A paper describes a structure:
Previously, we reported that T. vaginalis cyclophilin 1 (TvCyp1), a cyclophilin type peptidyl-prolyl isomerase and homolog of hCyPA, plays important roles in regulating the nuclear translocation of Myb1 and Myb3 proteins and forms a homodimer in both crystal and solution states with the active site residues highly exposed. As compared with TvCyp1, TvCyP2, containing an extra segment at the N-terminus (N-terminal segment), as shown in Figure 1A,B, is found primarily in the endoplasmic reticulum (ER) and regulates protein trafficking of TvCyP1 and Myb3 toward hydrogenosomes and also TvCyP1 toward the plasma membrane. When adding TvCyP2, the cis/trans isomerization rate was enhanced so that new cross-peaks due to chemical exchange, such as cis-G54 CαH/trans-G54 CαH, were seen, which confirms that TvCyP2 is a catalytic enzyme and possesses PPIase activity. With the SEC-MALS experiment, the molecular weight of TvCyP2 was measured at ~20.01 kDa in a solution similar to theoretical molecular weight 20.947 kDa, TvCyP2 forms a monomer, which agrees well with most of the single-domain CyPs but not TvCyP1. The secondary structures of TvCyP2 contain 8 β-strands and 3 α-helices, β1: residues 16–24, β2: 29–36, β3: 74–77, β4: 81–83, β5: 116–120, β6: 131–135, β7: 148–154, β8: 175–184, α1: 43–53, α2: 140–142 and α3: 157–166 arranged in order of β1–β2–α1–β3–β4–β5–β6–β6–α2–β7–α3–β8.
Using the ARI crystallization robot, we performed crystal screenings of TvCyP2 under various conditions and found that four needle-shaped crystals gave good X-ray diffraction data, all belonging to the space group p2(1)2(1)2(1). In all four crystal structures, except for forming a typical canonical cyclophilin fold, the N-terminal segment contacted the active site of a neighboring molecule. A detailed analysis showed that these interactions include H-bonds formed by the N-terminal T7, R8, I10, and S11 with active site W141, R75, Q83, and N122 residues, respectively, and also by N-terminal S11 with Q131 of the S2 pocket. In addition, some hydrophobic contacts were observed: N-terminal A6 with active site F80, N-terminal V9 with active site M81, A121, F133, L142, and H146, and N-terminal P13 with S2 pocket Y93. In comparing the hCyPA–CsA complex structure, the corresponding active-site residues in hCyPA, R55, Q63, N102, and W121 form H-bonds with CsA, and F60, M61, A103, F113, L122, and H126 have hydrophobic contacts with CsA. Because both the N-terminal segment and CsA have similar interactions when binding to cyclophilin, this finding let us assume that the N-terminal segment behaves as a substrate like CsA in the hCyPA–CsA complex. Because the N-terminal segment of TvCyP2 exhibits such unusual interactions with the active-site residues, one may wonder whether this interaction is real or purely due to crystal packing.
Residue numbers in the entry: 5 to 184
Write the structure that this text describes.
Amino acid sequence: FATRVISAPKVTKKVFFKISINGEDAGTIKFGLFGDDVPKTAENFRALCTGEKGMGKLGKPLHYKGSPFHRVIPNFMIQGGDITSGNGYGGESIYGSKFADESFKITHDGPGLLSMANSGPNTNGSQFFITTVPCPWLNGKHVVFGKVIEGMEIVKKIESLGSQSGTPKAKIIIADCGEI
């Protein structure tokens, strides 16, 4: 017996980041994941939040805890999730290697969307970005899989610490993370 009329992917799992900036607590971002529509991508992100898969194949934890927001661009997006080298050139999915683009059905229509960073077709790992504006030119190239449901103010604060090139002007860390 259906009862809702939703104009968006349904949120099926909720996760969070606790953010530190230059070593100080900056608040919590909460995310809703679109697990009915992109389950493999949603499940990857969820498991990296909890750390429950333990160690990956590259000698590093399959866990977002401690990873930085390494590229931060005002009026575009903020990007993080390098859990291997922790500097923006690495990352690892829970599936053992990069994984395929699951679906491009969900587009970059607005700010606050969670989407996979990549290095071309079918190269999803752990790195992600959060949009701060509509990014339609990224449609068909990046898999959207969730959205900010609380703490968009924190995303905007992070965004304000970036630069046009993306080099951050502060050290922004996922100090803790998990599933709600």
